[PDB]
Amino acid sequence: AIASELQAIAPEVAQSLAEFFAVLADPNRLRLLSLLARSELCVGDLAQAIGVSESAVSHQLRSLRNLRLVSYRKQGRHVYYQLQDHHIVALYQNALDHL
Amino acid sequence: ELQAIAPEVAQSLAEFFAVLADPNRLRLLSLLARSELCVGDLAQAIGVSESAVSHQLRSLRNLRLVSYRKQGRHVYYQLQDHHIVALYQNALDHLQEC
């Protein structure tokens, strides 16, 4: 009934959103995000959980940091990574559940 | 005590996000996220022919991103499930500020 009052997202917004989803179209990134969706973790824990070197994980996390998919905090001699925000958690979980 | 998602699951999820990385598809989903709509409504909304939108919807139906229902003498399309609605809204919100 409200068809006449609806308009699609702007083209530039659709492009920006498409780019966001393209960044997530990476199984390796998703494996890392699946762990962070359940607990804040250091690179050491992430590396052992997946089965790769910490250097490998560190490299993958740099891209994720730059793309604002993950963030980190420092406490003592540890650096804990986590998902950027609750929106990332929600979209990840909803996508997984849809599948 | 933590295990990542299975390799096959990560791959399937990656493919799912890959099909969403399409501006034209997202424009259509952005409309359906607000309300179910007939092909006529969608075509006029984005400014293309009904045939064009019908073609695009064909792909979205097979990709399980949209579904449809018969309401009287018309067919209305909708997002496949609420998860699509929620992931779409959360992604857009993320790309925004407060």
Measured between beta carbons, the chain B residues lying within 8 angstroms of A7 are: 31, 45
Instruction: Classify residue A84 by burial, with Cβ atoms within 10 Å: 0-12, 13-18, 19+.
Output: middle
Contact A57, A46 (CB under 8 A): yes
Is the CB of B10 less than 8 angstroms away from the CB of A34? Answer: yes
Q: Shortest CB distance from A91 goes to which of B2, B80, B87? A: B87
Report DSSP letters for B45-95, one per residue. Answer: HHT--HHHHHHHHHHHHHTTSEEEEEETTEEEEEESSHHHHHHHHHHHHHT
Q: Shortest CB distance from B4 goes to which of A34, A84, A98? A: A34
Is the CB of B95 less than 8 angstroms away from the CB of A16? Answer: yes
How many Cβ contacts (< 8 angstroms) between chains A and B? 136
> In which residue are the tokens 């979209």 written?
A91
* Boundaries of domain holding A64: 1-99
- Tokens linked to A88: 């990332």
- Tokens linked to A31: 């494996």
B78, HSE (Cβ side, Cα atoms, 13 Å): 12
At A78 the three-state DSSP class reads: strand
User: Which of B32, B82, B95 is closest to A24 using CA atoms?
Assistant: B95
Distance CA B77, CA B84 (A): 14
The span from the first CA to the last CA of chain B, in angstroms, equals: 34
φ and ψ at residue B8, rounded to 5 degrees: -65, -35
User: Which of B33, B37, B35 is closest to B54 using CA atoms?
Assistant: B37
What CA–CA distances, in Å, run from B36 to A21, A48, A88, B32?
Answer: 23, 46, 26, 5
At A15 the three-state DSSP class reads: helix
Domain count, chain A: 1
Distance CA A28, CA B4 (A): 10
CATH number at residue B37: 1.10.10.10
Is the CB of B27 less than 8 angstroms away from the CB of A15? Answer: no
